[PDB]
Amino acid sequence: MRIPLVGKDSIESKDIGFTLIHEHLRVFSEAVRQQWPHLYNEDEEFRNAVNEVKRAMQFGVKTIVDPTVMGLGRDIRFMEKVVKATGINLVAGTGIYIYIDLPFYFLNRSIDEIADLFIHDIKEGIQGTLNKAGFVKIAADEPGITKDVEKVIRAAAIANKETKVPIITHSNAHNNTGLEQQRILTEEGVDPGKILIGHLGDTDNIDYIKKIADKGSFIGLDRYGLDLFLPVDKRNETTLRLIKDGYSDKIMISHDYCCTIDIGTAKPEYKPKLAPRWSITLIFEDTIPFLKRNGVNEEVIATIFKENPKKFFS
Amino acid sequence: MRIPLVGKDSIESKDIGFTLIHEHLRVFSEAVRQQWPHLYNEDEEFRNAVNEVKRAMQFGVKTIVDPTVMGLGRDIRFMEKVVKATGINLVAGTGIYIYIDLPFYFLNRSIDEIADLFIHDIKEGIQGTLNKAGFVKIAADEPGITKDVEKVIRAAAIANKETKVPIITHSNAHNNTGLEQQRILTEEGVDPGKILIGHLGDTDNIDYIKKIADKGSFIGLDRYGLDLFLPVDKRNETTLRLIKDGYSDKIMISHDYCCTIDIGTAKPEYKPKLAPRWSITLIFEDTIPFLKRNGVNEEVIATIFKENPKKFFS
Ligand SMILES: CCCCCCCCCC(=O)N[C@H]1CCSC1=O
Ligand SMILES: CCCCCCCCCC(=O)N[C@H]1CCSC1=O
Ligand SMILES: [Co+2]
Ligand SMILES: [Co+2]
Ligand SMILES: [Fe+2]
Ligand SMILES: [Fe+2]
């Protein structure tokens, strides 16, 4: 017992198997869904998540890590239902996803108070259930490291030191938010190897990507299919080059796929342009085959999808 | 019938009686309550709301207008419960309360889509019930009229023009947001007399306040008790001056009282410093008696608390 699973006994990290380290069963804006429920369709949402997960499993995915947290509409009971329907190993997290400011709740509250929220989810359980958080998720994006973003990062560090769960980040690959997240976490005493810096796959600036890896953290080549950020072929070229340059033991790969997401950008009519082949199994259809016919040994595949997740959670 | 009430048949505006135009039964951050329910206590929240409303009614309040909307934790079923327990006339609103950016939901969504949400609440009902919204609430504060804040303002104008419900605003009294809100709404073709520009009582700059009244809108002297914004006695002096200068036709008075609110600023420890006498009945204890001692007659009080709300909703 080591990594907590939704709706299951916890597992030892050696038993995680082939892992997708960053996918979403469902993403929504909490306040919008609360205020305007007519916009949403839970049956559709359930069907989509179950269908995607089932296809992932038939490609041999054993574990999915789902970093839906506050600000992305985390719902542990929804996650429970998808587990019961599929039998997936599902790792749920805690944390806060913001780009600018915290919710008004956090006015005149300390970093300690925020960390207490994360530690609650990890140690006690999530949203009144006994499903526990297996990692902390934090974000920064275009606005950079604002005061409140930094507060959340330091709170995540406190949670990691207390509970030893790893940290997954959302960053923007085109500013230095990823590097800064790494810096602040490590200065606060987080083991660099307990950090996945997210969304670095959004750039082909490999010098920047290697910088983070060199400082000891996993690098998230983690949005395969999201062409609007970076097209699949450039992602593949970047992935291949990083492998050839010796970085396979820092690489993590995923789709960031949202089986449903409520943002207007994800309207069906935009899909062909923005994310034509985006799904939870694209890497099996494209990336892994591509790697194998470009000289990449099976051992590297094992490293990225089994060994690295195992280390991360160890 | 043409003001909708929570849990009651709609009433004619002439029957609104003595009104508190801006009070909150309960405020919370949607995403925080959703993610960490352990932080909250609905029984306590209910008791607080019921007790405050009961005292208001003892002092002759017939109708309370509650501008709790998206971003402040509007919950129409909680509101229903308080109505059942008290018998108050309660006017619920629709709208969006943001200072900077919209929820991610609204990425690549039009102003029209926003207005449709408001119009849904007005014409169809709120959160899956048949309780309908009687006004739209919008906000701006220190960050000023941002792109997204502006979008919401324009959506409110669409809603008013379509349904004729009035608009209540939140503004920052020190940075012209209230005047800008008025300008944008009236430029869109909203009748100035269907706008309440909020939180103008937070300043004793009467030149600024008069500017807004002169352009035909109601002026919100509406945070009595919140000394951290402006002390009661200075509000009183400002209120009295405006009345002496003939402006009672535009004056609206309230507390902005929150029977519960979840922000750290409102920890009990802080109340004596920030808001010692803040409650839903302060104006009966202090303000109204003060005005009377200064020669303000019953008719003026009736204009402010009965006639003006009547006009607002007519
Ligand atoms: C029609 C399809 C277009 C793609 C949707 C727009 C891009 C959405 C990206 C997205 O899902 N971002 C969130 C969710 C998981 S991580 C994160 O920060
Ligand atoms: C210790 C008690 C002092 C309260 C300080 C916090 C002031 C909150 C005022 C307040 O209510 N502001 C928001 C929330 C409801 S409407 C609105 O615009
Ligand atoms: Co992300
Ligand atoms: Co306000
Ligand atoms: Fe994600
Ligand atoms: Fe308010």
Numbering used by the authors:
A (entry chain C), B (entry chain A): 1 to 314
What does the paper say about this structure?
PLLs are natural lactonases endowed with promiscuous phosphotriesterase activity. A structural analysis of SsoPox, a hyperthermostable counterpart of the PLL family from Sulfolobus solfataricus, has revealed that loop 7 is shorter in SsoPox than in PTEs; linking the active site to the loop 8, which forms a hydrophobic channel that accommodates AHLs aliphatic chain. Indeed, W263 is located at the start of loop 8, involved in the dimer interface of the enzyme and positions the lactone cycle of the substrate onto the bi-metallic catalytic center.
Co-crystallization assays with C10-HTL were performed using the same protocol but adding 4 µL of a 60 mM C10-HTL solution (in Ethyl acetate:DMSO; 1:1) to 120 µL of the protein solution. The diffraction data for W263F and W263I-C10 HTL crystals were collected at the Proxima-1 beam line (SOLEIL, Gif-sur-Yvette, France) using a PILATUS-6M detector. However, whereas detergent-induced flexibility has no effect on the lactonase activity, we isolated variants of W263 that exhibit increased lactonase activities (W263T/V/I). These variants exhibit dramatic improvement of their oxo-lactonase catalytic efficiencies (148-fold for variant W263T), while the activity for the best AHL substrate is compromised (3-oxo-C10 AHL; for the wild-type enzyme).
